[PDB]
Design a protein around this ligand. Structure first.
Ligand code: CDL
Ligand code: U10
Ligand code: PC1
Ligand code: 3PE
Ligand code: GTP
Lengths: 139, 98, 60, 59, 49, 347, 115, 120, 320
């Protein structure tokens, strides 16, 4: 979870590059998780094309992470309003556009600029207002 | 926690890897499974002899008696797939697909 | 060409109903099409063990 | 009268999995007994030559 | 008649219906006696009677 | 299978579960777990077909590994506290270890690929046994240890349970397979509320149980394994297929049927405890269940399906095996919502 | 030490015997010696094929009885207890269960070496 | 809201101190519905065995409606019992912990400054 | 109290009843080979219960009043019309074949039930392992399409698997011209126009397939009509048999219990005869299915359970 804190510690806007690097690392982390799942449940033929599968998945996920990070912080600095759902929206769904480009289909990329963008807006929403996804037993 | 505890815990971790990460053999996998309980048996005996838990001295053999029973059926299942399929090689073990 | 067909019978039905149904399409056959090999299932148990253990660090 | 499902309307489920993409084609439906057709005959009696020197035969 | 096989439930199974009726009666009078003793116990317990 | 042997397998399975929910020493809990394991393998092999051997082998491997990890958690909290009493754990990794050890026995997380397959392999009566009775023990252990379970762990695990439960059943026609996936979804449903308050997971366990008997008894009263086979049964048993449809409505949780009550209760207590995002995910994903539920309903009763010529002489024969408790089994699983306050009895 | 010294002495002694056995004699090392043997012939194409067997049941009931033998092993220490009555009844239970398992093995073919 | 309550005898349906509570009336609307709940079980039973649904073996219907209404009655006492206990230690905890429940002061609407929103 | 698990528990053992008078014998052969006469005389000579050849109307002959139903209400196929037109392929050919096969399945079911409950050998005319010949020949003349044939084989594997075989089978071998002479002697016009190709063809399908596929599991005593008229020799050598090949000599009381469990519940005996696969002739329309329901449910003694039908004159229903 310290990797997630490596994103949380950096505030939006200030030191955009380190925030982007943290986003790259987190995208690579989820990328390696999904690549391990693919390499484990889906059987390949040769080690080279298996690690090629992992490379495609990781490089994709890292691309969404990278652009999300950089665009989020630049949106936070140019408008000097880190507390903005759109700040996360634009970069989150440009991540969807880049994902669609990675899978060479801009149709699902456009469909992604809805869903990835809205979800980034919602996670920003929760982070501002303390919305819990995993609430502790309280009452 | 001294090195003996490390060694038997670490032996259990690699038994977990060996049995659970199947290579190609069902018999060798359940062999790793029963080695697993050997590691746990030694581990359990350690604290129990250490702390003078006099009653718990009977827990290992109890823990033993059931565990072999598992293997008692495991290998017993092994023959039942073997006579029809031919081997214990679990890659033909695919008939139940959908 | 704008009220009927393209909007009602092309667009709105594509966005909410058909796109979500296609998502369920594409994610039902990548979820429920495992051959049945005990190996790959067990390595799915495997990497889950560490993701629960150290990667997420559930205990921490 | 109304419409009832044609033979094709019941056919579309069929096919083991009814929402198939590609590899699902090679997913033959199981038989109705739930027992597969008995595989290659392994019945054997392991021929023994029991000889030929074998001095326990007067030689 | 009709079906040449004897019907499986073609005769009044007297014992089973007997126990069903006897039960239902038992459950009923146990129920109302129960309710009466609960209400009486309540009134004599909390000071009503 | 000797009738008396089958009975003695019944009651050793049931006694293995009883030992789980009555014992206090941890070793005894393990003992009951393997008593049940050792006892349920032969009944799964009652038919003795290679599919049954496959299902039994997969069950044995999964559950034996799970019980061994159970002893690992057992040994660790013994080592770090020297107390075999079942209570809050004193070592975190021991708690996690027990969590996945039990989950593999429940089929919640990626440790759930066994259950659809094993359900496919065995006969439908063995399916009823597997998907009804072999949950009470792991649920009871999880209830007894609710004091210290990593809420993140249990919540995400239930989330995947319901999610792959909904998605896996979409592309399945075998009634056993879709029932296994539905059971996985219900597994996620109760295990989501497991950490917060165990009365509600007990209630959802009861409702899922009664619904599952009410379901399986209808299946083997119709004697169907494929969707087309059930569709052919719209003729011979119209009442059975109508009740088929009504309980398939109770499946998803459409009010005022019984199946809505556990969803409602779980969501209400989740919202009592500031978990507002979490319930909406299962609330949406229950539509995934409702989808193949509606497909089964359409194949069963709502639309007439093409029968077969030979099938008509089946008209001359009546189901002789009574398969008792079915009427009340249906009724409790259909109309109990006006009795929701009775949940306080379990508490 | 002591005990371990005896085990070491015995294993090394055995290994010296096998070393002298396998090294001292001289062999011409000709090919046709390697041909395997069966009462004059060679074992055709067998001696490693899967062994279609029946006394597997006897082999497994061995283990199942061995667990119970392990269970009843502590008896000589157990007889030195204050509540001898409970020890008597419960050990007698253990041997009765031994006999009952053997009897069920008996009537239901079982220990009868399968054909 | 309970299994760790002090003095809680296990496997005990109806505890002795429950009798201080008003027993459910024989004409309790919940009870009579669960009596009706008995009818649905009986009516379905004849339908499963393709027996005459309306009047097949009233003996089966009698136990179906009498057993269900009985087990309903005992359940209702326990239902009221737990709700009573939940409300019982309710006030005991509140009275024994006055600090955690401050006496909120009541102020009429003439003293508050709620701002009206022009809805145009 | 039918045969239940309690029956086997309290001491109902089938093995205390089977003796040498427990032979499942079937008489087979060409159409009108006289095998029915041989079955009758064998049954009377050895005290074995005879069963008639299960035809179209076997269901009523086994259930209900015993009175034949309508063809539309039972079978929808006509063997007479099959003779009239075997090439129209409206459905009569293969629907006829499938209905006959499943009626044979019910016949074998009640035969084995009678043997397991009583202990008397049963003699049949053709069985599950015999009827395929006809369809095979019916496919040679083209009366049945290839998909109907493979479906019939699929259902035969799916149904006959659980059923252990006869003991012995007597084949009344008759040459084709003699068979044509016999069908001429009979006089029913429907069985005149039978192609000699079909008549000889079922004979090959019997000779080259039925005997050598059966002979391993059961003893073959194929005979000629010259002998089949003599009732003495046919039963004397049937008596003088070891009956030591097949599953029959080797199956304990447990297999007997499972078999009697299955046969006494006819509903799942023919569970797989429901044909959970869609083919043109076999399939009956949904509207047709509902209508044939509404003209069968009101049929007396078929709406409610036996002993519960007030329409036919049942009594004490309110306490039933
Ligand atoms: C709520 C709580 C109550 C729920 C009640 C309803 C659900 C229970 C199952 C269906 C009951 C109705 C019925 O007809 O049952 C027999 C019916 C017929 O038995 P079968 O094994 O299917 O078929 C073979 C025949 O029994 C033919 O005989 P056989 O010789 O092949 O087998 C012997 C026969 C029993 O023979 C005897 O003589 C007895 O075996 C059984 O009945 C199977 C269970 C084990 C033995 C019986 C002991 C039961 C206690 O079986 C079933 O319907 C399901 C089989 C398993 C039954 C027990 C399941 C217990 C756990 C389920 C969840 C319980 C609630 C948990 C909360
Ligand atoms: C007509 O129809 C017929 C048949 O059928 C139809 C038949 O069938 C047969 C076949 C029948 C026969 C061949 C009959 C045989 C009859 C005999 C009289 C010959 C056998 C005689 C015996 C007394 C039997 C002996 C067998 C015994 C005891 C056991 C048999 C089983 C074995 C496994 C033994 C096999 C042989 C072995 C192992 C070789 C022996 C090796 C040793 C003794 C090694 C010794 C080593 C040491 C001492 C080491 C220590 C040394 C030293 C110096 C110590 C000090 C050293 C230090 C380092 C300290 C016939 C003829 C027939 O007419
Ligand atoms: C209808 C809609 C609502 C349905 C609600 C559930 C109804 C069906 C189940 C009712 C019967 C089962 C529960 C009650 C029972 O029989 O015994 C309760 C109990 C069982 O004993 P128990 O409560 O000590 O042990 C079980 C404990 N739990 C439930 C947490 C696992 O009987 C008692 O006398 C309770 C004593 C302790 C009270 C706390
Ligand atoms: C709510 C209804 C949900 C299902 C609606 C769609 C199915 C409608 C019925 C389809 C089959 C048509 C048919 O012929 O059914 C005959 C069958 C038996 O006839 P009968 O005994 O008259 O049924 C009512 C009781 N006398 O009667 C029926 O099948 C009618 C329905 C019987 C079950 C009652 C309704 C469901 C209760 C839960
Ligand atoms: N299509 C078809 N017809 C069959 C089958 N089995 C029997 N039949 C028909 O059954 C009818 C009666 O056959 P037999 O009993 O041999 O003829 P029979 O004239 O009654 O004379 P006997 O043999 O002496 O009883 C003939 O029309 C056969 O073709 C079958 O499997 N398929």
């Amino acid at each position: 979870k310290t990797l997630l804190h490596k994103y949380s510690d950096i505030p939006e806007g200030t030191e955009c590059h380190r925030k982007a690097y943290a986003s790259t690392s987190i995208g690579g982390a989820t990328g390696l998780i999904v690549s391990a799942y693919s390499i484990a449940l889906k059987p390949p033929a040769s080690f080279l094309e298996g690690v090629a599968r992992t490379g495609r998945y990781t490089f994709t996920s890292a691309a969404i992470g990278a652009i999300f990070g950089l665009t989020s912080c630049i949106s936070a600095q140019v408008r000097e309003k880190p507390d903005d759902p759109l700040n996360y929206f634009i970069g989150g769904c440009a991540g969807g556009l880049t994902l669609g480009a990675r899978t060479r289909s801009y149709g699902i990329g456009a469909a992604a600029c809805a869903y990835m963008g809205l979800t980034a807006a919602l996670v920003k929403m929760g982070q501002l207002e303390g919305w819990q996804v995993f609430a502790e037993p309280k009452v | 926690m001294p090195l003996v505890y490390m060694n038997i815990i670490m032996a259990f971790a690699i038994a977990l890897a060996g049995l659970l990460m199947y290579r190609s053999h069902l018999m060798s996998s359940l062999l790793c499974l029963e080695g697993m309980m050997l590691s746990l048996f030694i581990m359990s005996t350690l604290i129990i002899l250490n702390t003078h838990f006099t009653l718990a001295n009977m827990m290992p053999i109890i823990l033993l008696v059931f565990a072999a029973c598992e293997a008692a059926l495991g290998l017993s299942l092994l023959v039942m797939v073997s006579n029809t399929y031919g081997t214990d090689y679990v890659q033909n073990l695919n008939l139940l697909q959908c | 060409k704008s009220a009927s067909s393209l909007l009602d019978l092309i667009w709105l039905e594509t966005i909410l109903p058909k796109t979500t149904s296609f998502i369920q399409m594409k994610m039902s056959i990548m979820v429920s099409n495992q051959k049945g090999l005990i190996k790959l299932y067990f390595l799915s148990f495997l990497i889950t063990i560490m993701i629960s253990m150290t990667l997420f660090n559930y205990h921490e | 009268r109304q419409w009832q499902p044609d033979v094709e309307w019941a056919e579309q489920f069929g096919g083991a999995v009814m929402y198939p993409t590609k590899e699902t084609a090679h997913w033959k439906p199981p038989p109705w007994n739930d027992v597969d057709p008995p595989k290659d005959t392994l019945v054997s009696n392991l021929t023994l030559n029991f000889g030929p020197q074998h001095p326990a035969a007067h030689g | 008649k009709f079906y040449i096989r004897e019907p499986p439930h073609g005769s009044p199974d007297w014992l089973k219906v007997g126990l069903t009726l006897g039960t239902s009666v038992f459950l009923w009078i146990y129920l109302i006696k129960q309710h009466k003793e609960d209400v009486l116990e309540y009134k004599r317990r909390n000071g009503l009677e | 299978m000797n009738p008396i042997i089958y009975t003695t397998l019944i009651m050793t399975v049931m006694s293995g579960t009883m030992l789980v929910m009555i014992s206090s020493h941890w070793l005894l809990i393990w003992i009951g777990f393997e008593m049940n394991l050792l006892a349920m393998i032969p009944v799964l092999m009652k038919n003795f077909n290679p599919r049954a051997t496959e299902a039994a082998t997969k069950y044995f491997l999964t559950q034996a590994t799970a019980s061994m990890m159970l002893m690992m958690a057992i040994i660790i909290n013994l080592l770090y506290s020297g107390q075999w009493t079942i209570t809050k754990m004193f070592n975190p990794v021991a708690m996690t270890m027990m969590t996945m050890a039990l989950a593999m026995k429940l089929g919640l997380s990626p440790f759930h690929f066994w259950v659809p397959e094993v359900t496919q392999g065995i006969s439908l009566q063995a399916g009823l046994l597997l998907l009804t009775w072999q949950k009470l023990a792991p649920l009871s252990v999880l209830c007894q240890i609710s004091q210290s379970i990593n809420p993140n762990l249990m919540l995400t695990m239930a989330m995947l349970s319901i999610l792959i439960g909904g998605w896996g059943g979409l592309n399945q026609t075998q009634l056993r397979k879709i029932m296994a996936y539905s059971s996985i979804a219900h597994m996620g449903w109760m295990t989501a509320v497991l950490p917060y308050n165990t009365t509600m997971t007990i209630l959802n366990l009861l409702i899922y149980i009664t619904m599952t008997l009410a379901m399986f008894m209808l299946l083997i009263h119709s004697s169907a394994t494929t969707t087309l086979s059930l569709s052919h049964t719209w003729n011979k048993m119209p009442v059975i297929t109508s009740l088929m449809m009504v309980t398939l409505l109770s499946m998803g949780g459409l009010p005022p049927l019984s199946g809505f009550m556990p969803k409602w209760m779980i969501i209400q207590e989740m919202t009592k405890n500031e978990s507002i995002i979490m319930p909406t995910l299962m609330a949406m994903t229950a539509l995934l269940n409702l989808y193949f539920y509606m497909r089964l309903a359409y194949s069963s009763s709502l639309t007439m399906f093409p029968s077969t010529n030979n099938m008509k002489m089946k008209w001359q024969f009546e189901h002789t095996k009574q398969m008792k408790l079915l009427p009340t089994m249906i009724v409790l699983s259909t109309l109990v919502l006006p009795m929701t306050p009775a949940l306080s009895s379990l508490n | 030490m002591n005990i371990m010294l005896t085990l070491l002495t015995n294993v090394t002694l055995a290994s010296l015997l096998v070393l002298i056995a396998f090294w001292l004699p001289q062999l011409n090392a000709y090919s046709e010696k390697t041909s395997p043997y069966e009462c004059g012939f060679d074992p055709m194409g067998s001696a490693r094929l899967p062994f279609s067997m029946k006394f597997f049941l006897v082999a497994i009931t061995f283990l199942l009885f061995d667990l119970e033998i392990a269970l009843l092993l502590p008896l000589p220490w157990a007889s030195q207890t204050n509540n001898l009555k409970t020890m008597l009844t419960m050990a007698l239970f253990l041997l009765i269960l031994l006999a009952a398992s053997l009897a069920y093995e008996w009537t239901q073919k079982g220990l009868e070496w399968a054909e | 809201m309970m299994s760790g309550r002090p003095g809680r005898v296990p496997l005990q349906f109806l505890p002795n101190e429950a009798r201080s509570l008003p027993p459910p009336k024989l004409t309790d609307p919940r009870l009579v519905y669960m009596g009706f709940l008995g009818y649905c079980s009986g009516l379905i039973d004849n339908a499963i065995r393709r027996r005459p649904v309306v009047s097949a073996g009233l003996h089966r219907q009698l136990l179906y409606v009498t057993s269900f209404v009985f087990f309903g009655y005992y359940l209702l006492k326990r239902q009221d019992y737990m709700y009573a206990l939940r409300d019982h230690d309710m006030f005991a905890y509140v009275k024994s912990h006055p600090e955690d429940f401050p006496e909120k002061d009541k102020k009429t609407y003439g003293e508050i400054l709620e701002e009206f929103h022009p809805v145009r | 109290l039918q045969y239940g698990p309690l029956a086997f528990v309290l001491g109902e053992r089938t093995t205390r009843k089977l003796t040498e008078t427990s032979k499942v014998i079937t008489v087979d052969g060409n159409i009108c080979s006289g095998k029915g006469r041989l079955a009758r005389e064998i049954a009377e000579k050895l005290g074995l219960r005879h069963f008639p050849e299960a035809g179209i109307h076997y269901a009523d002959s086994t259930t209900g009043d015993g009175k034949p139903l309508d063809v539309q209400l039972s079978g929808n196929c006509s063997l007479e019309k099959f003779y009239d037109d075997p090439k129209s392929n409206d459905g009569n050919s293969y629907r006829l074949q499938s209905w006959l096969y499943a009626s044979r399945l019910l016949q074998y079911a009640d035969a084995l039930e009678h043997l397991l409950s009583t202990g008397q050998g049963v003699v049949l005319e053709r069985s599950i392992y015999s009827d395929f010949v006809f369809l095979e020949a019916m496919y040679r003349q083209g009366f049945i399409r290839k998909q109907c044939v493979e479906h019939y084989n699929e259902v035969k594997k799916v149904t006959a698997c659980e059923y252990l075989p006869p003991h012995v089978v007597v084949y009344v071998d008759v040459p084709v011209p003699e068979i044509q002479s016999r069908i001429q002697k009979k006089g029913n016009p429907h069985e005149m126009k039978i192609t000699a190709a079909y008549l000889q063809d079922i004979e090959n399908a019997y000779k080259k397939t039925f005997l050598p596929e059966m002979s391993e599991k059961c003893e073959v005593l194929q005979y000629s009509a010259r002998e089949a008229e003599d009732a003495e020799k046919v039963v004397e050598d049937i008596e003088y048999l070891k009956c030591d090949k097949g599953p029959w000599p080797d199956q304990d009381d447990r297999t007997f219990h499972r078999l009697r469990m299955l046969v006494q519940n006819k509903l799942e005996v023919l569970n797989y005869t429901t044909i959970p696969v869609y083919l043109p002739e076999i399939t009956i329309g949904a509207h047709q299915s509902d209508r044939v329901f509404q003209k069968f449910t009101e049929l007396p003694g078929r709406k409610y359970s036996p002993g519960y039908n007030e329409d036919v004159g049942d009594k004490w229903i309110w306490l039933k």
